[PDB]
Amino acid sequence: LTLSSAMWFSWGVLLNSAPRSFSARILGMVWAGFAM
Amino acid sequence: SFTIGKAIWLLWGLVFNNSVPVQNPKGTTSKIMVSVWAFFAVIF
16 A cells, blocks of 8 residues: 555645655655645 | 545635645545646646
8 A cells, every 4th residue: 555655645745735755755845846 | 434524624625725634535536636626726
């Protein structure tokens, strides 16, 4: 269920309305700032 | 086990892209329709 949850969190970053991200939080914050 | 009729207030608060987050189910359904409606609300 980790794969579907990470997919849905990748959609939720763009959804504009969290798994273990020890180095992936940099990826998420860059993608979110870029998206907004 | 507590969002029988509370999905109404859930989506009606997520009309304006900010509400109280209730955990969406694992059936790939509510998340996709809320993503489409959230894209529409960004357009709005």
